[PDB]
Amino acid sequence: GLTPEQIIAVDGAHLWHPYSSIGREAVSPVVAVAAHGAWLTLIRDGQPIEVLDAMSSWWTAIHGHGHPALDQALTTQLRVMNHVMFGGLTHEPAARLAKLLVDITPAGLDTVFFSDSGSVSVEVAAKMALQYWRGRGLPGKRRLMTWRGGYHGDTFLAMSICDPHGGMHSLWTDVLAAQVFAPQVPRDYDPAYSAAFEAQLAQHAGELAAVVVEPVVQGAGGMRFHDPRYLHDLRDICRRYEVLLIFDEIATGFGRTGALFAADHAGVSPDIMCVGKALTGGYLSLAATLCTADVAHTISAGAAGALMHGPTFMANPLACAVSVASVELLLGQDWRTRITELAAGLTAGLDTARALPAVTDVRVCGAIGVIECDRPVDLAVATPAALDRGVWLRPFRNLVYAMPPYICTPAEITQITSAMVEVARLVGS
Amino acid sequence: LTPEQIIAVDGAHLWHPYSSIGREAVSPVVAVAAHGAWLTLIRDGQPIEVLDAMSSWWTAIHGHGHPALDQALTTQLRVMNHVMFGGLTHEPAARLAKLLVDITPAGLDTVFFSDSGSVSVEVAAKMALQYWRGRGLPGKRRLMTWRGGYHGDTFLAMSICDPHGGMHSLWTDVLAAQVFAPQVPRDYDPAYSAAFEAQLAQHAGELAAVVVEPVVQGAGGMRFHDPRYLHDLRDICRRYEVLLIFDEIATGFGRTGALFAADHAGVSPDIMCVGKALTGGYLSLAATLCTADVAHTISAGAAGALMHGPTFMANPLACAVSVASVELLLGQDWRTRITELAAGLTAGLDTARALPAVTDVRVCGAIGVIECDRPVDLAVATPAALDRGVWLRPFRNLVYAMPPYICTPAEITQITSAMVEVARLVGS
Ligand SMILES: CC1=C(O)/C(=C\N=N\C(=O)c2ccncc2)C(COP(=O)(O)O)=CN1
Ligand SMILES: CC1=C(O)/C(=C\N=N\C(=O)c2ccncc2)C(COP(=O)(O)O)=CN1
């Protein structure tokens, strides 16, 4: 039992926040006291106010908070079995979820490794790729290649494939693996980009295990969109030069970009795939790494005899149960129409933002809207403005942006876009 | 899905920990329920009740489906499943942080929440790396530890795992090269600590931290060592200006007979990891704590921040069940409970010492180990335990248990009886 003022006091003294300091925070965190549907209840000047979760709590809350069907699946599982070890045991929530994932991901992804976060599923993906080649008698193939602008997590391997300015930084000179970086992938399709990619890959091929990318949308590294055709070229390059392809769909997964997985826009399958975030409907942390039967059987027949990974809470029944229900809920409705409407709503609402002085781009892709400005967005100016409009927004760098819950009404998208348009206008001043 | 369908979906599509696809020497057993210290498993088409002797890998200290913890979870679920921790704070996080700073070794004032043990370990290393960068000494970037340890499966965590291992020979070259002192022995030996100091001395300018599991090394070999070694480590680290990190992910929350295993020695590390028992085994959550000084040095550094922030950082649901699990631990006489467990483990396992294939028997708090003279065949051990109403998971040459704190004396006796019978079968 703590009051909002007591929460603030404990938090200031004792809580780290994402990429934050202790005792140097420019502004106090705001107290969140509830979340229901698309709305959060927050304390502002000692008063609870309801505001739209424009960001879906970082891509996670696809059906909104406290969706009756998701709450119900969680409590139904809670009464039967909270958790058992996954060593020598299996269970229904893991089986059901693995079943759904293999059916609905791009063709050929036949096996599923559960883990407890996105960064962990990325390191598992890398470990699959590395063990793969050792199982082929090619231990020299151990480096990773990616393109700039990417983000794959904060654990040390994951960091090595993050954008070097995204934070490498300079700050981590050594201690990171030195990976192969291609230039930023452009928005519009240019065959010259893919040709230069291939030439660069070609000369490293004998030391490359895999290419790892976010398909179609790069999220936390700067909300950039690229033509799906590039993914088709990667698949092609990777096949021809014998390098595995990893798609990191932790942010792009489960309908967000207008296809079920963004790889579907290109009609391509990677060899290894990561999912997370929206997987659980934003209730709990869970992730999965899927790989082809070939990858699975090469690992298993290699010297180690096994994938050498296994978190304590692997395949947690509670996480797997709420995920099963989150996935069925998406699939049981006309999700494609929902996303199309959302995209249209975002496009319409954000439109007037391009005629603003500080704004260099306005872009929409599925249920994702971005306003790019020509300077950093001042958080101590931006946050106040959006709160006043009943919206929780979180700009970073020069980007005002949103990934709203799938359940947002036209009135709610209008309200989100209007606060975004306003954040951009104040940037101009 | 029926159990048969679960088996079918599983063998086709599910990776298990440290497992193959399609080459599993044994099928997994379907688990369909868990209540208190008991699992309901399907064996030959029939549900059977078995004791969770391992506490689902150290996690289920209060057993499964404890009413206080179920209710803490459903209460949070009613109010707020999850919000982003960037720009926002909430009551579950504050309550759990308040609790953790109060009960951990003195001087651990700040709390970084993550989603798993391996992450919290990488967070600990990052903290140490950023600390020395903030002091203008970016050369202090290597880690040192002793052999026999385990800190997780992510790539940095792996670098401080015992090299034989999981499994540096097959890895290395992608693993950062850390400094390894010899295996810490069971009984106190001053010459061991003198040599540790001497080895650390010649790497001091490149070491960010010593990282160890205190008192009990879990997944690396279920080895115990004298807590005075931790006193030596704290002294060495202070004199040579290397941070000290205790990985208490397995040892935390009462399990070794003190609240935290660092307490057996009265030592405070600079950085500490907790996990597993933290949530009472309901959900994955972990935490990394460090001193105010480590926090301030990082925060005044070039970065001006600790450069980590998982999507689900400080998840309300996971924090809420954790708050309830810790409070349930503190609101009972846990110390007497663990002593009773230990006495019961020792009494029940005494008989294994005489067995032909047993090389050692050891207990430390609610942890019991029969060390055998050959690796244990799971195809023999598993049905043998199941025939006695117990879920045991041996590894390497070890038959061992870390039972839920709620186990009655008869249940502890049933567990140890099964362990003894597994050990008798190994010897043949
Ligand atoms: C002291 C210590 C640990 O014991 C662990 C993990 N322990 N893992 C198990 O006990 C285990 C054993 C066998 N199979 C799966 C997990 C970890 C890793 O935590 P995580 O496996 O990521 O949740 C870090 N520090
Ligand atoms: C594509 C992709 C990811 O987007 C992420 C994490 N995304 N993080 C956030 O969006 C985020 C944003 C702002 N602050 C903290 C995290 C990760 C890492 O996930 P994790 O943070 O370890 O659960 C891996 N792949």
Side-chain angles (χ1 to χ4, degrees):
Chain A
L2 296 172
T3 69
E5 284 191 35
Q6 285 175 291
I7 291 166
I8 302 284
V10 169
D11 175 283
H14 307 297
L15 284 162
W16 294 93
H17 282 262
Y19 319 92
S20 79
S21 79
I22 299 285
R24 301 205 177 284
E25 297 297 90
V27 200
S28 280
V30 165
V31 182
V33 296
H36 308 109
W39 299 81
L40 311 176
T41 308
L42 305 180
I43 304 301
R44 199 200 192 194
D45 297 337
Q47 146 157 292
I49 67 158
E50 289 178 295
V51 308
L52 277 153
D53 185 1
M55 324 283 286
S56 291
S57 296
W58 294 319
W59 310 85
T60 63
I62 53 157
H63 309 295
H65 301 273
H67 187 288
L70 310 199
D71 290 359
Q72 186 60 59
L74 201 38
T75 52
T76 295
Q77 182 64 32
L78 187 59
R79 286 190 286 268
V80 196
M81 184 169 83
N82 65 166
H83 180 75
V84 288
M85 51 193 263
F86 208 53
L89 308 172
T90 194
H91 45 91
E92 178 162 20
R96 285 180 67 193
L97 192 56
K99 176 62 172 156
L100 272 156
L101 292 182
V102 305
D103 289 353
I104 72 165
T105 51
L109 298 157
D110 291 358
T111 78
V112 186
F113 191 106
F114 291 114
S115 76
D116 311 300
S117 70
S119 306
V120 177
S121 64
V122 170
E123 306 226 351
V124 165
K127 181 174 293 183
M128 284 172 171
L130 262 58
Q131 282 194 245
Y132 178 85
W133 294 108
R134 292 170 172 279
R136 296 275 314 265
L138 296 154
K141 282 167 84 52
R142 90 235 274 156
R143 297 182 79 187
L144 306 174
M145 178 176 187
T146 181
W147 50 39
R148 284 167 189 272
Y151 177 74
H152 300 279
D154 287 322
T155 52
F156 279 82
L157 179 289
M159 280 168 72
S160 82
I161 57 163
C162 177
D163 186 78
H165 308 269
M168 298 209 333
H169 181 25
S170 280
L171 206 150
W172 302 105
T173 156
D174 205 329
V175 314
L176 282 66
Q179 307 287 21
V180 178
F181 286 88
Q184 179 58 62
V185 59
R187 184 180 111 242
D188 301 331
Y189 181 77
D190 187 344
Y193 182 84
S194 308
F197 195 107
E198 160 172 4
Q200 187 183 15
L201 183 146
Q203 81 173 246
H204 291 288
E207 45 171 35
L208 282 172
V211 165
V212 186
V213 297
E214 297 155 277
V216 186
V217 175
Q218 293 182 305
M223 298 304 285
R224 288 187 184 82
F225 307 156
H226 61 266
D227 192 297
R229 197 165 185 168
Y230 289 124
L231 307 171
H232 180 98
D233 297 345
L234 297 190
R235 176 69 281 173
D236 175 60
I237 296 158
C238 286
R239 175 190 298 116
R240 277 186 294 111
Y241 286 98
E242 286 189 289
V243 167
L244 303 167
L245 182 56
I246 307 171
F247 286 160
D248 176 351
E249 297 226 41
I250 287 154
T252 60
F254 308 96
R256 180 59 68 184
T257 73
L260 201 51
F261 295 102
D264 296 337
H265 290 289
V268 127
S269 285
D271 297 291
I272 296 158
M273 180 178 177
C274 303
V275 292
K277 285 174 181 285
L279 172 66
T280 59
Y283 273 72
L284 293 164
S285 195
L286 178 72
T289 309
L290 296 93
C291 73
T292 66
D294 179 60
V295 165
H297 288 262
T298 304
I299 295 165
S300 306
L307 185 60
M308 294 311 188
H309 210 103
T312 307
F313 288 97
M314 183 176 186
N316 176 237
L318 292 173
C320 288
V322 68
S323 300
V324 167
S326 187
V327 169
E328 288 177 343
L329 180 60
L330 182 65
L331 294 171
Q333 72 196 278
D334 186 3
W335 64 262
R336 182 106 49 173
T337 303
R338 191 80 272 284
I339 308 286
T340 300
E341 284 162 27
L342 285 172
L346 291 164
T347 302
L350 296 171
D351 195 52
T352 77
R354 48 173 45 101
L356 282 157
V359 169
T360 57
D361 195 43
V362 177
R363 52 176 178 274
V364 172
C365 177
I368 303 156
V370 183
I371 296 161
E372 187 177 357
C373 306
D374 65 356
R375 69 209 80 168
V377 185
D378 183 11
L379 267 157
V381 156
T383 314
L387 286 188
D388 265 72
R389 277 141 208 278
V391 182
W392 183 250
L393 277 169
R394 195 125 188 107
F396 76 106
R397 284 153 195 175
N398 59 331
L399 303 161
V400 191
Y401 69 105
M403 318 76 92
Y406 297 169
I407 56 140
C408 285
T409 66
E412 283 161 353
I413 301 299
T414 290
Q415 181 173 349
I416 290 161
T417 59
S418 172
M420 287 168 75
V421 173
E422 260 311 305
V423 169
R425 184 146 36 234
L426 300 173
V427 174
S429 266
Chain B
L1 289 294
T2 67
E4 312 88 79
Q5 296 177 305
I6 286 160
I7 296 305
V9 166
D10 181 278
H13 309 297
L14 282 165
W15 282 97
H16 287 256
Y18 317 108
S19 86
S20 81
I21 293 281
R23 297 202 190 273
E24 295 302 284
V26 199
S27 271
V29 172
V30 185
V32 296
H35 302 280
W38 297 83
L39 313 176
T40 309
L41 305 189
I42 306 299
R43 189 179 197 197
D44 306 336
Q46 310 302 343
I48 64 167
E49 296 298 301
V50 299
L51 284 161
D52 193 2
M54 322 300 301
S55 303
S56 296
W57 288 318
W58 314 82
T59 60
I61 56 168
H62 304 298
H64 302 271
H66 189 287
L69 311 202
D70 286 357
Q71 223 142 0
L73 216 161
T74 57
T75 298
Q76 191 53 48
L77 190 74
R78 208 160 303 253
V79 156
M80 190 174 72
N81 68 167
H82 175 78
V83 303
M84 68 170 82
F85 213 49
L88 297 175
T89 193
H90 52 69
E91 205 186 339
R95 281 184 72 193
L96 182 51
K98 179 170 210 145
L99 267 167
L100 291 176
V101 298
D102 271 343
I103 71 165
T104 49
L108 297 158
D109 283 329
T110 67
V111 180
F112 192 107
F113 289 119
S114 65
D115 309 301
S116 80
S118 297
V119 177
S120 82
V121 168
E122 305 243 335
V123 170
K126 193 170 295 193
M127 272 176 181
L129 264 45
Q130 286 199 240
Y131 172 83
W132 292 112
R133 253 134 248 246
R135 297 277 312 276
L137 294 154
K140 291 177 78 54
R141 65 161 151 260
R142 295 182 76 200
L143 303 172
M144 178 178 189
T145 188
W146 46 40
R147 283 176 194 266
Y150 180 78
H151 304 274
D153 284 328
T154 52
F155 278 94
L156 179 58
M158 284 167 79
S159 71
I160 53 179
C161 169
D162 179 77
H164 334 316
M167 175 42 146
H168 290 34
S169 58
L170 302 158
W171 293 108
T172 299
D173 40 81
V174 273
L175 293 195
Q178 308 298 12
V179 179
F180 291 88
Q183 167 70 58
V184 61
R186 175 193 73 211
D187 304 328
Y188 185 79
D189 187 355
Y192 177 90
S193 293
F196 193 100
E197 177 170 345
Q199 185 183 13
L200 180 144
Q202 63 187 345
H203 297 280
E206 66 184 354
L207 288 169
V210 162
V211 186
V212 294
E213 300 156 275
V215 176
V216 181
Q217 292 177 297
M222 301 299 288
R223 287 174 183 91
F224 309 149
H225 56 266
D226 200 296
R228 293 171 278 164
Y229 289 122
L230 305 175
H231 191 85
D232 289 350
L233 290 194
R234 173 76 278 168
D235 180 55
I236 292 163
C237 284
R238 192 175 285 108
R239 284 184 289 109
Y240 287 85
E241 302 183 72
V242 173
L243 295 170
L244 175 64
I245 308 184
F246 286 160
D247 177 354
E248 292 234 30
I249 286 156
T251 53
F253 304 100
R255 166 76 63 185
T256 72
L259 193 55
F260 296 101
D263 302 350
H264 291 293
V267 178
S268 278
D270 292 284
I271 300 163
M272 179 176 170
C273 309
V274 300
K276 286 181 190 280
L278 169 70
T279 69
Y282 276 74
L283 306 162
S284 202
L285 179 73
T288 312
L289 292 82
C290 69
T291 68
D293 183 70
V294 169
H296 303 343
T297 303
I298 287 160
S299 300
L306 183 51
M307 301 304 205
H308 215 101
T311 301
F312 287 100
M313 186 176 185
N315 173 244
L317 288 186
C319 282
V321 73
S322 291
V323 160
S325 176
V326 182
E327 286 184 344
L328 179 67
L329 183 60
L330 301 173
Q332 77 186 255
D333 178 2
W334 60 266
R335 207 192 288 274
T336 295
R337 183 86 284 270
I338 295 307
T339 305
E340 292 175 359
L341 290 166
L345 288 168
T346 296
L349 299 164
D350 199 47
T351 156
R353 306 173 96 93
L355 295 166
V358 169
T359 51
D360 188 48
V361 180
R362 50 181 183 270
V363 167
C364 172
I367 311 161
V369 180
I370 298 172
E371 180 179 326
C372 303
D373 72 352
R374 71 204 77 179
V376 184
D377 185 341
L378 292 180
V380 167
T382 309
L386 291 179
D387 288 354
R388 280 145 190 105
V390 186
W391 184 249
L392 287 169
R393 193 76 178 157
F395 77 98
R396 285 156 54 171
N397 56 328
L398 314 163
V399 187
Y400 74 100
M402 319 77 86
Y405 300 169
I406 58 150
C407 286
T408 68
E411 285 166 350
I412 296 301
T413 297
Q414 183 172 353
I415 291 168
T416 52
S417 294
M419 293 170 71
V420 164
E421 289 316 315
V422 168
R424 189 189 313 279
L425 290 174
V426 171
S428 224

